[PDB]
């Protein structure tokens, strides 16, 4: 089950699953850029989230061939969701938006896997 992927083959296969998340409006808006705790007024963010991830970082990694294997891309998307569920309360808009993106992703990534 070892396989060497061509970065452009990975990119073409995975990019549509990422585009599916970006297309969610307004649910993708809090996930489009890295969390800046001071500028968002959430100074405890890095006390709780030690491995931040967002759509712009995942896109940059896809675009520069930093994923060797599909599971590495999926791990970063899952990390982004896990961070938002960890930091935010179940009652919050961001937590609910995260749950929407995770549903969309589960649909998109199944066939690709
Ligand atoms: C359309 O939905 C929203 C619009 C604004 C906001 N925001 C606010 O109410 C305050 C600032 C802004 C905002 N919140 C967050 C926020 C906060 C906590 C988070 O935990 N995990 C994540 C991810 C996360 C994200 C981010 N933002 C700023 C977003 C909307 N920027 C706005 C500037 O352009 C890029 C996107 C949140 C949402 Cl759910």
Curated annotation (Swiss-Prot):
Residues 44-90 are annotated as: Interaction with histone. Changing residue 90 to E: Impairs binding to acetylated histones. Residues 5-112 form the Bromo domain. It comes from the Eukaryota. It is linked to Chromosomal aberrations involving CREBBP may be a cause of acute myeloid leukemias. Translocation t(8;16)(p11;p13) with KAT6A; translocation t(11;16)(q23;p13.3) with KMT2A/MLL1; translocation t(10;16)(q22;p13) with KAT6B. KAT6A-CREBBP may induce leukemia by inhibiting RUNX1-mediated transcription. Rubinstein-Taybi syndrome 1: A disorder characterized by craniofacial abnormalities, postnatal growth deficiency, broad thumbs, broad big toes, intellectual disability and a propensity for development of malignancies. Methylation of the KIX domain by CARM1 blocks association with CREB. This results in the blockade of CREB signaling, and in activation of apoptotic response. Changing residue 95 to C: In RSTS1; mild form; impairs binding to ASF1A and acetylated histone H3. This is CREB-binding protein. It is found in: Cytoplasm; Nucleus. Transmembrane segments: none annotated. Acetylates histones, giving a specific tag for transcriptional activation. Mediates acetylation of histone H3 at 'Lys-18' and 'Lys-27' (H3K18ac and H3K27ac, respectively). Also acetylates non-histone proteins, like DDX21, FBL, IRF2, MAFG, NCOA3, POLR1E/PAF53 and FOXO1. Binds specifically to phosphorylated CREB and enhances its transcriptional activity toward cAMP-responsive genes. Acts as a coactivator of ALX1. Acts as a circadian transcriptional coactivator which enhances the activity of the circadian transcriptional activators: NPAS2-BMAL1 and CLOCK-BMAL1 heterodimers. The gene is CREBBP. Found in a complex containing NCOA2; NCOA3; IKKA; IKKB and IKBKG. Probably part of a complex with HIF1A and EP300. Interacts with GATA1; the interaction results in acetylation and enhancement of transcriptional activity of GATA1. Interacts with MAF and ZCCHC12. Interacts with DAXX; the interaction is dependent on CBP sumoylation and results in suppression of the transcriptional activity via recruitment of HDAC2 to DAXX. Interacts with phosphorylated CREB1. Interacts with CITED4 (C-terminal region). Interacts (via the TAZ-type 1 domain) with HIF1A. (Microbial infection) Interacts with HTLV-1 Tax, p30II and HBZ. Residues 82-100 are annotated as: Interaction with ASF1A. The KIX domain mediates binding to HIV-1 Tat.
């Amino acid at each position: 089950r070892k396989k060497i992927f061509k970065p452009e083959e990975l990119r073409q296969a995975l990019m549509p699953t990422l585009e599916a998340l970006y297309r969610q409006d307004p649910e993708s808006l809090p996930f489009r850029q890295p969390v800046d705790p001071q500028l968002l007024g959430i100074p405890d963010y890095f006390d709780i989230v030690k491995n931040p991830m967002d759509l712009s970082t995942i896109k940059r990694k896809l675009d520069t061939g930093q994923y060797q294997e599909p599971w590495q891309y999926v791990d970063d998307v899952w990390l982004m969701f896990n961070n938002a569920w960890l930091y935010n309360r179940k009652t919050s808009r961001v937590y609910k938006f995260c749950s929407k993106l995770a549903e969309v992703f589960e649909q998109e990534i199944d066939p690709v896997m």
